[PDB]
Amino acid sequence: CCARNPACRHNHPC
Amino acid sequence: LDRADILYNIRQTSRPDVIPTQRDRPVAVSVSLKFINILEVNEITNEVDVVFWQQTTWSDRTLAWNSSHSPDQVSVPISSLWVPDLAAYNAISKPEVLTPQLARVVSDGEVLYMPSIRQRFSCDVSGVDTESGATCRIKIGSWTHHSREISVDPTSDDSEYFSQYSRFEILDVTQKKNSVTYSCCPEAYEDVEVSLNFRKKG
Amino acid sequence: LDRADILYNIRQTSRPDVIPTQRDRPVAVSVSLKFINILEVNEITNEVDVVFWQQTTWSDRTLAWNSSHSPDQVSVPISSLWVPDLAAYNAISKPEVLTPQLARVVSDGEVLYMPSIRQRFSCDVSGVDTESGATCRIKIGSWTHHSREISVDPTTENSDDSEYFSQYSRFEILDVTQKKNSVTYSCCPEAYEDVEVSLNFRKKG
Amino acid sequence: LDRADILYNIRQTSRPDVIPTQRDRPVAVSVSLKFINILEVNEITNEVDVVFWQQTTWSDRTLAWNSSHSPDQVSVPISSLWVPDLAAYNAISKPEVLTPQLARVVSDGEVLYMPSIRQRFSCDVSGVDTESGATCRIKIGSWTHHSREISVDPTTENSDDSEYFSQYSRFEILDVTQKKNSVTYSCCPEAYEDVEVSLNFRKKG
Amino acid sequence: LDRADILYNIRQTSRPDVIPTQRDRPVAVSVSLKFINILEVNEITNEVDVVFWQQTTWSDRTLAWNSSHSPDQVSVPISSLWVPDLAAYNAISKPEVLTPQLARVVSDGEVLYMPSIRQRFSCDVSGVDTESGATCRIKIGSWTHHSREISVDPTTESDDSEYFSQYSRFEILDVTQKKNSVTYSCCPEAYEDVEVSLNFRKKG
Amino acid sequence: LDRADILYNIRQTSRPDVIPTQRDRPVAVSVSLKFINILEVNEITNEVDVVFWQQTTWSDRTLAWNSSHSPDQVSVPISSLWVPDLAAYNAISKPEVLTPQLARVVSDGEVLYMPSIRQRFSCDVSGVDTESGATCRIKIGSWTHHSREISVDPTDDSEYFSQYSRFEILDVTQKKNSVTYSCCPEAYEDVEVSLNFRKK
């Protein structure tokens, strides 16, 4: 993504 | 097949650092917390310390063997297996594992890992001495895998394993699953939310 | 055979990750606690800290050797042997092992492991200041092996409950009793054995 | 390529103890702190305990693979990868990593490692009970690599705030600011790059 | 022979998991505690925390080398050697080893290991504020080797509190280190020990 | 040589368990403490907790490489090198190492190891609230190498002290000595550090 959920931050850095 | 052959076959074929996906399907992981104790409710800095058995199951059909004239299960050290990278998103202490780090592998490829864990969480503990009590919410999911690689489902309330010697008592335990999709990214992110409703004994 | 050969032969043939059993037959494990001290009784948060020697024995015939013109026993580090995955089901802290992590292996394949352990438990400590005192219950069994793989039994535990106990502790031992339990859960048709050890103690006063 | 092949290829070719510089150009490391909780403010000793996610990213083209008919990313344990030797220059405790020690590696060789960390700092906690609050400064950069080997930059995203911060903390976050520096010490004739993160917070109410 | 060769040769012939008995004679281990500090005397719980250097020596002739035109001694990490499984039978805490885990090996095969150790014991501390003071007793011996495999002797010095911190709240009146053997009902054999008696009091 | 080859070559010729002596001369180790913080004084038990960077240098010519197209330095994990077995003889706690366990190796064979360390000592802290303050004395030397095998020399707070400490540094003196105990026939070199500090 950028935000919010840990795994999402891993897979779509920011 | 004897246990030596079973374990040998697991070492050939099990890669602890490779998620056992199978035809690009996620690994379906089920998780349930069984609460054993509530140890320190800190009224001054909204923190609670809980002990719980974290019952985790999943499949890795690469590990399967023929269970005729053979053991149907074995205990294998977790350093030989892939284990899901589950975390309590809102934990404020490292999970302390109290029990031997072994998992059960069944002949069909089912894996059961149930460590007893002690861990600290931030929770509102002001109402713990009231009749309705307080609620500690624990959010569990994969630390690095989205829902197309690892899916997480709950498998509520029981006091069966709870210490009768705790200062506290369990009013209720509820487990909901949460699945969110954000506009950036086509995949879904899953967690299990566990709610522990408890109070000081009278 | 010298000790070097004995140890060498144990390393060949011992598999620390494989329970030493033939088909459906369980490994018979015996357990006895010798209490050394009761250290921190927290009257406010029903918790107690105990130090105890955990006497654990079992057999592994794969380890046996011929004891003629040879040592009858050896000390071997536990990482070279299979050890039962015993756990105190109701502990609230990781067991702190105070002693060298060695077991005694006898030439017949009998293994004795007796670590000194410090560990915290939840127990009712409200009566610790009374004559009948309080009771700390420690439930020990295999974490992952059911009763067809590991059985767990108390020993015949004759000796002075207080024989090993520190004369300097603020507490004294009234009694130690051992019950065996066998628990079967709704998921799974096999049973898990434990030994429950009950430590009845009180403040000296 | 399946995930097994990807990981196999990472094990061949990744050297965890060798900084992945490409032509003596520095390895560009970005770091961003997401604060989750502030756990013990000690008014008397100017010490704070914080939990934060340390989002750290860099490139290592040795890890790259062809992502046609293949996964675009994998999770790899950090013991298989080089990771920057970042340290909080002003920490007074070892960083306690709360989360699985895995990094996410993309097919182009971009790596994301984001441990949740609990760590203690010496910082100015006077004013924490006021409206403007206190500021804890956390200074992070490479312990052994100067600016020609590692560069450190803040992330572009102070477009967030306290969505990450626990509703249950005694404290609230007023602001987080990130400044980049490069400092030269008397020990060492080259400059070390750091990010200084400023956490402005106060007691609730 | 240089130090590299000496260490190489030690790794080749040394078995850390085999007690170096010479034809089923016990291994003679000497042990001596040198007290550095007494840190937390808890009058309520009868507990004390001590720091001491544990001077331990024994022989392993398998390690010996020809010391002509060669170093007479070497520092070797203890994981490359057999070390006695000494324990304070009556300790209530895990021994915290403060120092690098190296032992000295001499060319004749004699090994010296002296870790600085911090550890907690149960001791009667009711008299610590009196003139005669209190006495903390530490029983040290092999955890798993009985008297036919390991013997344990004090080295006779007490003679002095040479190592003791001037800054401790406590002072040493006396240290005696006497040899014993214990038998418990657990174990039919005798285990040799040194019983160390630390007589101390709160300073004036 | 690239960094990978440098490390490879270090693993080949470095013996972490063998002191790198040249021709029976002692290994010259220089050691200096840079104080970062003083954390808990404990007026009741005469104990203090300090954080310091332990700046340690020495030479090991076995590690050297002679270039054409080579880096001047590398960071290597300390398990690849011999490191002096330095200890605070009078510490009452295990040193807690706060930083990555890497050392810098320079092409000439110079090694720089500077861990940030937290550690507890016994000191008289009754005067900590006075103007002349208290003094914490730290004796640092080799645990197992006597003066023919390892020599130890100083060379300064160095203004790396936390502005946020309850305490302030009045003075630091770092002087060389040698000790002999009744245990041991030889003399051991140390640096004796005096940290004079007081409450703000």
Curated annotation (Swiss-Prot), chain A:
The cysteine framework is I (CC-C-C). Alpha5/5 pattern. The equipotent ability to inhibit alpha-7/CHRNA7 nAChR subunit by both the globular and ribbon toxin arise mainly from the insertion of an additional residue in the first loop and partly from residues in the termini. This is Alpha-conotoxin AusIA. Expressed by the venom duct. GO terms for molecular function: acetylcholine receptor inhibitor activity; ion channel regulator activity; toxin activity. Its main location: secreted. GO terms for cellular component: extracellular region; host cell postsynaptic membrane. Changing P6A: Loss of ability to inhibit alpha-7/CHRNA7 nAChR for both globular and ribbon toxins. Belongs to the conotoxin A superfamily. Disulfide bonds join C1-C8, C1-C14, C2-C8, C2-C14. The record marks A3, R4 as: Important for the structural rigidity of the globular toxin, which impacts ability to inhibit alpha-7/CHRNA7 nAChR. The keyword Aminoacyl-tRNA synthetase does not apply.
Curated annotation (Swiss-Prot), chains C, D:
One of its GO terms (molecular function) is transmembrane signaling receptor activity. Residues 95-198 form the Ig-like domain. Disulfide bonds join C123-C136. Keywords: Disulfide bond, Glycoprotein, Immunoglobulin domain, Receptor, Secreted, Signal, Synapse. Expressed by glial cells. N-glycosylated. One of its GO terms (cellular component) is membrane. It comes from the Eukaryota. Glycans are attached at N66. InterPro entries: Ig-like_dom (IPR007110), Neur_chan_lig-bd (IPR006202), Neur_chan_lig-bd_sf (IPR036734), Neur_channel (IPR006201). It is found in: Synaptic cleft. Coiled coil: none annotated. Homopentamer. To the extracellular portion of ligand-gated ionic channels family. Binds to acetylcholine. Modulates neuronal synaptic transmission. This is Acetylcholine-binding protein. It comes from Lymnaea stagnalis. The lineage of its organism: Eukaryota, Metazoa, Spiralia, Lophotrochozoa, Mollusca.
